[PDB]
Design a protein around this nucleic acid. Structure first.
Lengths: 127, 98, 71, 53, 124, 104
RNA sequence: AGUGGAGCCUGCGGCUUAAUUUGACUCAACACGGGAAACCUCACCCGGCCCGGACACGGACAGGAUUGACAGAUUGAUAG
């Protein structure tokens, strides 16, 4: 369960780059194009000292067949912006007290992990 | 803290010769004043001195988050033996007399 | 109070069983030391140090983290 | 067996403290004082500050 | 100077070397020190449990200056270097061996140092 | 030759500053150097504003301390060392006096 | 001149939250704690490292108390 033409129908550009082209560019060439939030993170970060986390992504994607999703790979970071390399993995996105498990589909690219995990209820007062 | 008794002797010798030793207190610090044991937060210098202190031999004055070690008479005698250097070698106090 | 307690056992100290340490080389008569395990050529190596056999990794613990045959 | 025990701080009020205590909020960094206001009140005599107005 | 006795001549050098930091105690340190030219004495035990220990030491001695003088009891050799105060009913680190030890750098002139060196030269 | 020398005086204490300035001027001319006379610069009012109340409940009470640093300079023109020499002596505590090689 | 009415902001109550750290309650509590808090901070909550178990005394014990670490397991962390 990975890449385009599969979990997508909204499609077109994220932000300037069509998902076809996106998925077959590297993150290098991605930040060059139309990307401003992502661009700041990658430039100033400079590959961003989340090294081991990213390697755990590749590891469990590899060891699992490409026909199925990983064994789930947790992270504490949720400020990670989805890059085409990641896509098709299944990411435990920490909330400081829960790991919400979210498959990263081709429609999520350029968005943040954190936006798909909640710290917050739909809010009630007995509602 | 931990660390060998080569670092400890170096600190003690410097206290003995100067007659003062100083450290400062922060846990985000990397490095105590007066050489230290070198880009480390509050610990080795402080702890070596603290061990020395427990057994007597040095008087510690604290104020403005800094540790001023002031060498005592008994301490001059103790370090003289520990360092095993000749039985007067002058610890930088007694000097000029008023 | 926050959260924070942990069990221990020495989860907090190291002993690595009780260690074999230096009991290797082969000696015949007086006096020679004939190679056993593997030896590590570096300048940060000692002069009776070894590479732990652990096959397809062979690493000198006198070296800091480096210097590894995979043969 | 320390591996981490510091983290870079140069950001916000949390990167500095008073030079006799640890405190946050209202840290005078002007003129290189580096004291919290509460402490500065007691030492305002010693710096040379004076009230006439 | 002096001429002392032969067995106490060793002990003083062992004590000085420990404070200097240069007394190689127990097999791993002893062997490493021996196989380098820093060594200038090797005092062995021969009352070791499993004398393969002593055989390895002697083998090591052959290369990088041969130094041999034997003394008796492991525990005495340990004590001479210093790991106890020789005071009180207990000590926390009390009397236990170190067996064969090697001395890197005497670190003082005259006395026991001069005795052992002179003895070693005309011996070998 | 005559050399242009600038004596800066900085302090906070009017009366002390003033009678240091006096002594420099009077002793200068006494064994002949330039008199000039003081160029008063604007006193700078360092203002610090703090809460009077630790732990803020009650009323809004504010305390404002000032500290008034005073500056003056005097430009003497006369020869090299004997300027800075005759001036800077005869004073020790509590009024800064700087003698500067500045000005040609 | 308004304020109270409106929008938003900020503190406060109540609810909700694992956490909404917390002081204060007519004035003499309440954009008040110079408090414009991203995480860091941070006290709160969800987890983990480390000993800074000094020193004295006892035991273990240099045949190895303890320190470090490859790769693999792991985990937020190829954090030995």
């Amino acid at each position: 369960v990975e890449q385009k033409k599969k979990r997508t129908f909204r499609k077109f550009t994220y932000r300037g780059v069509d998902l076809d082209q996106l998925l077959d560019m590297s993150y290098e060439q991605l930040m060059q194009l139309y990307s401003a939030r992502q661009r700041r993170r990658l430039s100033r970060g400079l590959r961003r000292k989340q090294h081991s986390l990213l390697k755990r992504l590749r590891k469990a994607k590899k060891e699992a067949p490409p026909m199925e999703k990983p064994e789930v790979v947790k992270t504490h970071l949720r400020d990670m912006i989805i890059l085409p390399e990641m896509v098709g993995s299944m990411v435990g996105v920490y909330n400081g007290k829960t790991f919400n498990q979210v498959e990263i589909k081709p429609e999520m690219i350029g968005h943040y992990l954190g936006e798909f995990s909640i710290t917050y209820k739909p809010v009630k007062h007995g509602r | 803290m931990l660390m060998p008794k080569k670092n400890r002797i170096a600190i003690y010798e410097l206290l003995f010769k100067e007659g003062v030793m100083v450290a400062k207190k922060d846990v985000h610090m990397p490095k105590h004043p007066e050489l230290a044991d070198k880009n480390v937060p509050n610990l080795h210098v402080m702890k070596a001195m603290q061990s020395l202190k427990s057994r007597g031999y040095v008087k510690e004055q604290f104020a403005w988050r800094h540790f001023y070690w002031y060498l005592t008479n008994e301490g001059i005698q103790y370090l003289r033996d520990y360092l095993h250097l000749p039985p007067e070698i002058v610890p930088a106090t007694l000097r000029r007399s008023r | 109070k926050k959260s924070y307690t942990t069990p221990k056992k020495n989860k907090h100290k190291r002993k690595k069983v009780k260690l074999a340490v230096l009991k290797y080389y082969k000696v015949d008569e007086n006096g020679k030391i004939s190679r056993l395990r593997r030896e590590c050529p570096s300048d940060e190596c000692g002069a009776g140090v070894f590479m732990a056999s652990h096959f397809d990794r062979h690493y000198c613990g006198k070296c800091c983290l480096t210097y590894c045959f995979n043969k | 067996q320390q591996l981490y025990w510091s983290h870079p701080r140069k950001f916000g009020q949390g990167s500095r403290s008073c030079r006799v205590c640890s405190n946050r909020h209202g840290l005078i960094r002007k003129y290189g004082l580096n004291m919290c206001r509460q402490c500065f009140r007691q030492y305002a005599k010693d710096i040379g500050f004076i009230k006439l107005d | 100077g002096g001429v002392m006795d032969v067995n106490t001549a060793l002990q003083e050098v062992l004590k000085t070397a420990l404070i200097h930091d240069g007394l190689a105690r127990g097999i791993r340190e002893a062997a490493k020190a021996l196989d380098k030219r820093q060594a200038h004495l090797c005092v062995l035990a021969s009352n070791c449990d499993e004398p393969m220990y002593v055989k390895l030491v002697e083998a090591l001695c052959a290369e990088h200056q041969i130094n041999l003088i034997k003394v008796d009891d492991n525990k005495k050799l340990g004590e001479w270097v210093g790991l106890c105060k020789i005071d009180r009913e207990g000590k926390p680190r009390k009397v236990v061996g170190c067996s064969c030890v090697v001395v890197k750098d005497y670190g003082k002139e005259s006395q026991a140092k001069d005795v052992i060196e002179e003895y070693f030269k005309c011996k070998k | 030759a005559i050399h242009r020398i600038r004596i800066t005086l900085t302090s906070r204490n009017v009366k002390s500053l003033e009678k240091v300035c006096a002594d420099l001027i009077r002793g200068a001319k006494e064994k002949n150097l330039k008199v000039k006379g003081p160029v008063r610069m604007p006193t700078k009012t360092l203002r610090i504003t703090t809460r009077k109340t630790p732990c803020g409940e009650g009323s809004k009470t504010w305390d404002r301390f000032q500290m008034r640093i005073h500056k003056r300079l005097i430009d003497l023109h006369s020869p090299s060392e004997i300027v800075k020499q005759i001036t800077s002596i005869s004073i020790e505590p509590g009024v800064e006096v700087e003698v500067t090689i500045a000005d040609a």
